[PDB]
């Protein structure tokens, strides 16, 4: 009631280091929290669902924005069989000169990552042809997360 | 050969500072005065924490951004011409 595990006094009383471990472990187990009832459990579940939806929408918005900004969608749609898709750029202080030289793939001006997720083909099929569409989708998904 | 008493528990359980010294300050008074005068702003805890975090972040970001391509290989950029993929991909 005083230490970090505010949802369980027994985990807060003991002075060893297992308090941290078991506080992290059982944070989502709403049935064992002290002074719990059915209403609180259901409402917490509802709020957790909303948070999870927000996280998913933010994730897909980030994917779309990064492909739009650092990718080669426009050059890919013209020659699908002879262009390697690009996921995002690479910035790394630890990279040496041969690493920078070897990782420069596609038509980019620096190191990139080839995308094996396959979102390029999906977005091409559903009817997107320019980066403006991807930027618009990113903004829309940001609004949905908000 | 008695090693336990109830009046004073300091020596019973062993609350000793083995290497504690109580000699007066051997530093020069002028040196101490100068250092005390010039170390005043860093005494507070929260202000020191905020200053350290903010200054470290700002300095690290500025050094990373301003640094040219000679120090950082990643800031030089590629030089050799690009090569094709296995099956003729670009």
């Amino acid at each position: 009631a005083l230490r970090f595990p505010r949802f369980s006094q027994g985990l807060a009383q003991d002075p060893t280091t297992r308090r941290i471990w078991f506080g992290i472990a059982t944070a989502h187990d709403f049935e064992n929290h002290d002074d719990i009832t059915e209403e609180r459990l259901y409402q917490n579940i509802f709020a957790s669902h909303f948070g999870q939806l927000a996280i998913i929408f933010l994730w897909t918005s980030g994917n779309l924005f990064h492909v739009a900004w650092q990718g080669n969608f426009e050059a890919w749609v013209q020659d699908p069989l002879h262009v390697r898709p690009i996921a995002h750029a690479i910035w790394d202080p630890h990279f040496g000169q041969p690493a920078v030289e070897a990782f420069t793939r596609g038509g980019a001006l620096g190191p990139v990552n080839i995308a094996y997720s396959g979102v390029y083909q999906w977005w091409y099929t559903i009817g997107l042809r320019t980066n403006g569409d991807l930027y618009t989708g990113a903004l829309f998904l940001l609004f949905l997360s908000a | 050969s008695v090693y336990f008493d109830l009046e004073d528990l300091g020596n019973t359980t062993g609350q000793w500072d083995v290497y504690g010294s109580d000699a007066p300050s051997p530093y020069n008074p002028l040196q101490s005065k100068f250092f005390e005068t010039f170390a005043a702003p860093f005494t507070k805890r929260g202000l020191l924490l905020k200053f350290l975090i903010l200054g470290g972040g700002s300095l690290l970001t500025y050094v990373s951004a301003t640094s040219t391509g000679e120090v950082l290989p990643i800031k030089r950029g590629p030089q050799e011409p690009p090569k094709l993929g296995p099956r003729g991909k670009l």
């Binding site: 005083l2 970090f4 750029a89 910035w91 | 975090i53 972040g57 690290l60 970001t61 990373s64 800031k75």
Partner: peptide, 30 residues
Amino acid sequence: NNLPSIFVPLVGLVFPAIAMASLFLHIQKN
């Protein structure tokens, strides 16, 4: 442009340092 040169150090170092300091302080606080 050079946005990565500014943003990568912030996410890599400064923000984790702030998060670790805050979390440790909140964990040990009575």
